[PDB]
Structure formats: C-alpha cells, structure tokens
Design a protein around this ligand. Structure first.
Ligand SMILES: O=P(O)(O)OC[C@H]1O[C@@](O)(CO)[C@@H](O)[C@@H]1O
Ligand code: NI
Ligand code: NI
Lengths: 379, 379
C-alpha cells in the first residue's frame, strides 16, 4: 500500500519543509504535500519531530562495519557494507577498490555485477581508486601494484562501464587517450594521488576529468608559484571535489574555504574503512596492516589510510565545525554527489517521481531510520 | 585657476563615465559632470580619449628610478622615487625601509618627516618591513638584524605615528601587547615574513593586524592539515592582502583565486626595487648584486631577486592575465589600498572634495600624464 512519513522537518534539496508529509508508493516518492492534504485513509509513520532528507550518497568507501572490499572481493562484502551504511544514514555508495592486481580488478567487476543484478540504487557502481597513480603520492597504496594505465585493462573497464561509476588516476604520466575512452564510456574520471602541476591537471580536465578525489590529500598543494592540483580544482568550475571531514584528514578552516570557492561542487565522502561502525585495533589493506589510533586510521609510519568517518558524522562536523548551514550540508552529502555521478534524476532529492531513498535523523544527529526503495527500516 | 580634464573615459571608483569631465580647483576635485555642463569660458585639457582614474597608491616600495631607500635614507631619495613613480601612474606610496638597525630606522623616520613636511599626499607614510620578522622566512633580510620587538623601539615607533603608516612583523614569537600598542597609535600592522600557524595568524588579527604583506611570499602556506598564514588570510574578512602581480612572484591563477576569495581586500603592490622605471642591468643591494634581465630581477644563479614591477603594469597584468575587469583592477590599485591605510577620505576616488591625484593612461596602458595635488604634468 501507499504510506506517508509525517511529523518531521523535511529537507527536499530545494526547501526546508514544516508541517508537510512525504507519500511513498512502491519504490518511489509519490508527493510532498502539506499534512492537511493527506488522505484520511492513508497509513502514517510518525517521525516524532525528526529530520527527513534523501539518503546519503558515499562516493568513496573502501570498507566498513568490520569488512574491507579489497580483502573479500564479493557481493556478500558489498552487501555487509550496505547494511552498516544504513546505521549511519548512508543509502547509496560506490564500493571502492584501491590499487591492486588485474585479477582483483576483474573479481570486483564481477562482484559489482553480481550485487547490482540483485539490488538497485544501493551500490551505484565500482570506484576504482588506482592503480594508475603516481608513486610519490601513494599514501597507503601499494608500491607493488601502482602502474601506468595500459590499453588492455582500460578497454576491459570501458567494456564494463555498466558496473563502473568512477576511476581515480594520476594523469601527469599516463596516456590522455585513456581518460577520453573512460569518459566516452560514461565512467567518471577523477584526479587523485597525483604529482601534477596546475598545468597538467588543467590539461586533464580538458581531457574529461570532472572529479577530484579527497581534496588536499595525496595531491600537490597550492603554493605561490605553483597552484598545483589544489589550485587547478579551485580554478576550474566544472570539477567536483570530494573532501573528508573527520577532523583528521583536513583542517576544518580549509573545508570552509573550499566550500566558499567550490559551493555546489564540494562533496562529502567518508573514504571509510573497516573500523567505521566497528570496534577494531587494525585492518588489512592489500597486504598492509592499517591501525586504528584515537579515531584515525594509520599505517606504521603515521600515513593516514582512509578513515572511520560515517556520512551522518560528516554532515554534523560540517554543520558544527565547518560553519555550513544544515540544508547545505545535506546537499553536499546527497544532491551534489548525485549530480557528480549523473544519478540526480533519480536520487538526491525529495520529490515526486524519484526513488524513495531517505534518511531520518534527530537533532543530535542520530539516524533513527532509513527508506530504501520505498522500504522503511528502523535503526 | 580652474580647469577641466576632458574627452576621456573616467573611472571614478564607483562608475565608468563616458562624455564627462572632471573639474580641478587648486588641489581638489571640484566636480565630475557632463561635458555639456562646463562653464563655456573654462580651461579644458583635452585628454584625447585616454582613461582617467585616481592615481595609483603603492603600499610597498623599497626603491625605484635607480635608488634604493635603504641605501640613501634621505628625503632626497623619497623624492627620486616619487618622480619615477609618476612615470608609471603611481602618485602616492609608502617609502619602505627593510629590516635594519635602530639608527637607520631613526633616519628613516626623519627622512619621511622632512619630505612630508614639504609635500603632502605623495609619501603617505613610512612602511617598516621588519626588523621583527622570523629568521626562518627571512628572504633577503639580514640575519644579523632580524630580532624580537622591544619596548624601546616600539615606544619610539608609536611616538612617531604621524609619519609611519605601516609596520610588517612576524607575530608568532613577539609580544601581542606590541601589536596593540602600534594599532592604538594609528599604525597599520601587517603580518609578513612569518612562520605562523593558522592559530597564531588568527591570534594576530585579534590583537589588531589588518594587513598581510605580499601574499604567498615569505609566509606559511595552506596545506591540508595546516591552513597557515595564507589560510588565515583567506578565513578572515577584515584582513587586506597585498599581492605582486608581475607574473614571477605569484602565479596568475593564484591571484585570480585570491581575488575571488578576498575581493575588496586584495591590494596591488609593486614591492619594487631600484630598476623599476630606470635603465639598469644590475644593482648591488646590502651586499648581493642582482641583475635586471628583460624586466626580471635575478641573482647570478637565475633565482628571483626582487621586483621591478610598476603599478600601471600591475593593473595591466591583472586585467590581462588574471582576468579581472579594468574598473575592478583600477580599484585594486587605488581605492582598496586607500581604504587599507585609512586615507579613503581624501584619496583613491574621483569625487567632489577629494584630493586631485589622478593618472591618465591610454588603451595600451601607457601612462600619458598625472595630476598631483591639482598639478597636471605630462609624461
Ligand atoms: O597528502 P596528505 O595530505 O599527506 O594525506 C594523504 C591522504 O590520502 C590517503 O587517504 C590515501 O592513501 C592517505 O595517504 C592520507 O589520508
Ligand atoms: Ni586515497
Ligand atoms: Ni618582503
């Protein structure tokens, strides 16, 4: 049957709504209408004054709730991740596989294909972060697998674009043609783990790169005579940029500045790993031990190795520490990520016709429930 | 006698006027009015379709037209600079003394007093760049003279505020009380040649710093976990930043980014040395000799050695390479600097009752003439 979510503040993406309701029908949003407009017969889930927004979309998520995608490359891993996400309001995500072997890349593609043939609008496709990086900005990435982009695997990726949302790579020393082919196959291409100058990064935007992976991390910073990759991102309006707001990856003052420059091009990601939503001392990250240490994820050397952030926390830290308004924070965690991967016509807003993927959260930012394809599940 | 500047495009700082004129009476702008409104028997100077604008205010000038100020610390040197300034549209400036001995600072104070006693609104005050810097970002400043700030010299600096417009220091390891004292005396305090964290930089703005000296040069830059000084300037509305637009000190894409962030607060400065508006092939400066190679300043290694920029060129570079509009660029050379040192009541604008300091330049940015306290003099 149809039902209506009721008694809540609703953040549609365009308007903050009081004394209205949202009518769900199947997998879809039927209507957002005033509460007095609601049919007498209609079933009601009453949300006790909490916030309602579209479900969060996480564009960079390596693992969570105890598991890692790189380590157990299966549909069931993706499945486990999806369910842990729900605890922190995240309804969609790109399962992210960092630098590894060709065989691992073929396994992930299969796994994505498997999971998505069963469930829609949850995993929105692979994010291949690596392996075509620059060894100098490797962070946690494996020195054994970082390699130049090659024609064969690039062709494989293109051929499987129906399960592949995004590729992060370093363009300085890789073939421009490979960018073009990926873009031509409808995969989103992102600069990251790159030692490019401002010029080279500009060149790769002209080639089709439209995204930047974790602004400020594993990229040439802005200095007086070399704007670098950071400057290029600040100077190119078409480029989205993901940014991690755990308080450890990037100083909040920088997130604030970035938002004033980037506005709707700034996107909240987690880059989260197995400890996000799980209690653990360390995890494996492609034969690397990564340790959980007072909220951070670090290797033996203190290099950060993803995060333990969740999407709800990223919204909150952004409101509370960065100084950004709530409705805008939510947009950075929903609508803007959706626009960046070209799913915004079905996800990222509360409006009629679109898919019922929603999150409810109280004033203290506790996620109380989600809707996923119309299905309401309490926390 | 009254006369009118005529057959020009006028850039008042608020509006761009066609088919108007400016009336000069003595040393004041009388009125800005349609040409048709001119008393038929008034003397007119036909400017031949040139651009008319307030004279350029350079807030950082170490020397030019052949001489360095630190070399000959006299009212005579200040006057050689002024006369060279006029050739490139600059009608007011801050004679800038770099870090030296107390004795030299006393001479500098005296040379400015004597000059300003004779002429007004040309030198608008001494700028002390140093000596209270940070050795770790010393650049060309002498290690033997860079020292903490001390009550005695601070007390004398204050005692002469009538002749000192500005002091650049590094605040991170000097006394806050000292900043307070200087600001209280109506001296502008600028952060510069510093190794301050963002936190330190913010503390200094709190204590009264309202300016930053040559943004991106000799300061702590903006990296992911450490916003630095560049970051603090970006995050503080009150703080003006001077910037050198020669194409060598700071990449043009960085100036574009900074303007978008800072607007009204971004000021064009030359920071010029001897070669500016002079024919030289080198100049010795406090020991090291620096060559003048095709409009660039280099030590025998080919490393940047200082600036030869003029204000009219700064403006042209800003229009032409940064992408900023003519009127806005003009504002960055006139109104904005004027406001930063608190002289906007009299200067930086073509308006009734304000001092007649004006610059006329053609479409090719060739200065054709200026007007200083009402006196028209062709180039
Ligand atoms: O380049 P930065 O500022 O040192 O940080 C790099 C960040 O990117 C990574 O997440 C990628 O491995 C970590 O290396 C770290 O968190
Ligand atoms: Ni990474
Ligand atoms: Ni300097």
């Amino acid at each position: 049957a149809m039902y209506a979510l009721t008694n809540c503040k609703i953040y549609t993406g365009n308007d903050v709504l009081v004394k209205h309701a949202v009518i769900i029908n199947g997998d879809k949003i039927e209507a957002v209408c005033p509460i007095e407009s609601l049919p007498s017969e209609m079933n009601v889930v009453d949300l006790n004054g909490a916030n309602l927004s579209p479900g969060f979309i996480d564009l960079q998520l390596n693992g969570c709730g105890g598991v890692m995608f790189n380590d157990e490359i299966t549909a069931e891993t993706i499945d486990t991740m999806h369910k842990a996400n729900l605890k922190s309001g995240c309804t969609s995500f790109l399962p992210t596989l960092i630098t590894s072997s060709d065989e691992n890349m073929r396994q992930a593609i299969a796994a994505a294909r498997e999971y998505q043939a069963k469930y829609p609008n949850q995993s929105l496709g692979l994010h291949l972060e690596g392996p075509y990086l620059n060894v100098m900005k490797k962070g946690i990435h494996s020195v054994d697998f970082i390699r130049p982009s090659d024609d064969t695997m690039i062709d494989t990726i293109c051929a499987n674009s129906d399960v592949i949302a995004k590729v992060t790579l370093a363009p300085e020393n890789n073939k421009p043609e490979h960018i073009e082919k990926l873009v031509k196959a409808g995969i989103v291409v992102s600069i990251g783990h790159t030692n490019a100058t401002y010029s080279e990064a500009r060149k790769s935007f002209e080639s089709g790169i439209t995204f930047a992976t974790h602004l400020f991390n594993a990229m040439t910073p802005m200095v007086g005579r070399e704007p670098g990759v950071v400057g290029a991102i600040y100077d190119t309006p078409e480029v989205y940029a993901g940014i991690i707001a755990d308080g450890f990856h990037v100083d909040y003052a920088n997130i604030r500045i970035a938002h004033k420059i980037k506005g709707e091009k700034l996107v909240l990601v987690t880059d989260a790993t197995a400890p996000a939503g799980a209690e653990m001392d360390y995890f494996i990250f492609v034969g690397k031990k990564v340790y959980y240490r007072d909220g951070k994820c670090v290797d033996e050397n203190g290099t950060l190795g993803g995060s333990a952030l969740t999407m709800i926390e990223a919204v909150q830290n952004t409101v509370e520490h960065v100084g950004i308004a709530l409705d805008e924070a939510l947009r950075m965690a929903t609508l803007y990520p959706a626009k960046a991967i070209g799913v915004d016509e079905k996800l990222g807003r509360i409006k009629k016709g679109m898919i019922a993927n929603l999150t409810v959260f109280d004033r203290d930012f506790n996620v109380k429930a989600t809707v996923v394809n119309g299905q309401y599940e309490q926390n």
